[PDB]
Paper text:
The crystal structure of PilF159–302 in complex with c-di-GMP was determined by molecular replacement using the NMR-solution structure of c-di-GMP–bound PilF159–302 as a starting point. The crystals diffracted to ∼2 Å and the protein chain could be traced without interruption from residue 165 to 301 with c-di-GMP fitting perfectly into the difference electron density. In sum, the PilF159-302 structure consists of eight α-helices and four β-strands which is consistent with the previously derived secondary structure. c-di-GMP is bound in an elongated, slightly bulged conformation to the N-terminal subdomain with only the amino group of one of the guanine bases oriented towards the C-terminal subdomain. The 10 direct intermolecular hydrogen bonds identified between the N-terminal subdomain of PilF159-302 and c-di-GMP are all conserved in comparison to the intermolecular hydrogen bonds described for MshEN, highlighting the importance of these conserved residues for the MshEN-like c-di-GMP–binding mode. The sidechain of K167 extends diagonally across the GMP1 guanine base plane with its hydrophobic region (Cβ to Cε methylene groups) located on top of the guanine base. Furthermore, the cationic amino group of K167 is in a position enabling a cation-π-interaction in addition to the hydrophobic stacking.
The traffic ATPase PilF from Thermus thermophilus is important for type IV pilus biogenesis, twitching motility, surface attachment, and natural DNA-uptake and contains three consecutive homologous GPSII domains. The N-terminal part of PilF harbors a remarkable arrangement of three successive general secretory pathway II (GSPII) domains (GSPII-A to GSPII-C) with high sequence similarity to each other. Remarkably, the GSPII-B domain binds c-di-GMP with a KD of only 6 nM and thus with an affinity ∼ 83fold higher than MshEN.
Numbering used by the authors:
A (entry chain B): 165 to 301
B (entry chain A): 163 to 301
The structure:
Amino acid sequence: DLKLGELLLQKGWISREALEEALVEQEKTGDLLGRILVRKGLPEEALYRALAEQKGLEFLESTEGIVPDPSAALLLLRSDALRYGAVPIGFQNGEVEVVLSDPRHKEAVAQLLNRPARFYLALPQAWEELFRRAYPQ
Amino acid sequence: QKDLKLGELLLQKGWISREALEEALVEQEKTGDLLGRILVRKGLPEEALYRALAEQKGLEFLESTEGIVPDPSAALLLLRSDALRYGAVPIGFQNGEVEVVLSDPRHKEAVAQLLNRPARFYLALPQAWEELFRRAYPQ
Ligand SMILES: Nc1nc2c(ncn2[C@@H]2O[C@@H]3COP(=O)(O)O[C@H]4[C@@H](O)[C@H](n5cnc6c(=O)[nH]c(N)nc65)O[C@@H]4COP(=O)(O)O[C@H]3[C@H]2O)c(=O)[nH]1
Ligand SMILES: Nc1nc2c(ncn2[C@@H]2O[C@@H]3COP(=O)(O)O[C@H]4[C@@H](O)[C@H](n5cnc6c(=O)[nH]c(N)nc65)O[C@@H]4COP(=O)(O)O[C@H]3[C@H]2O)c(=O)[nH]1
């Protein structure tokens, strides 16, 4: 499995020197590598596609057409949906479809859901819009 | 940003190296291929090409067309044959401008002259463009 910097280097979004400079910057700042690269010109959508590939998620370019199934939303308390950044939106072939806000949360969410699931990843605004739709207050 | 060449823009953005751009331009010297086509074939992400080309012609790059509900009244402003020939899908209206999604930034001027009215242009990747076209203009 590839690290994020290598995935992006291979794709050609960043240069070798750019990756080295970002890693050197991270040694002093503690920032996530992805945030540094985005600040230096990596599109956020390109970052998220690479992070999705690294964790076996499907990146969703848009959430606007999703109609959240209330039956699926039942599988997480709203408080858990927010804290874990996970919106169950529906079912497909006996799996619950779940949209994550952060690929790092895949494992924690999957363990908790404890059932076959298909994981998606969405950018922060599209995720928030989808979350409010599925879990209205 | 509208005054820079494609290579310069990609260099400025950190998406191409000076070496890669030199190679591509020298090969174009012999082949006459479109420059972005050469760069992509040598490994430039197609989306990096489209983002730079969008900046160059003042177009808004669309990461996705899947959330667009094409307004049938805007689609009337182009015959289907023109929509496909010019690679332009009129999708709606905002503030008295028509919103138009292009498949190729090089066609912006020809579409603008034809529409003859205030317009807001977008650029979408080929697959995303074709999907939107077929929705706005079923056969
Ligand atoms: N939601 C979100 N998640 C992000 C972001 N950036 C990175 N991640 C994810 O969070 C994990 C920790 O990244 P890190 O703090 O930068 O720590 C990274 C980084 O310090 C470092 N390193 C990362 N990439 C490379 C590389 O290409 N070459 C070398 N030599 N070291 C790398 O290894 C550590 C683990 O790398 P990864 O396996 O890829 O695991 C990454 C990656 O899965 C972001 O902006 N947003
Ligand atoms: N849909 C689409 N459009 C594309 C593509 N590649 C380039 N274009 C666009 O089409 C125009 C013609 O580019 P070209 O035939 O390769 O002709 C180019 C190229 O031969 C050359 N040249 C291009 N970039 C550079 C550069 O950075 N430095 C130098 N010295 N010469 C360049 O100057 C000419 C004008 O360049 P531009 O102003 O950028 O104008 C470009 C650019 O707007 C593509 O792959 N797909």
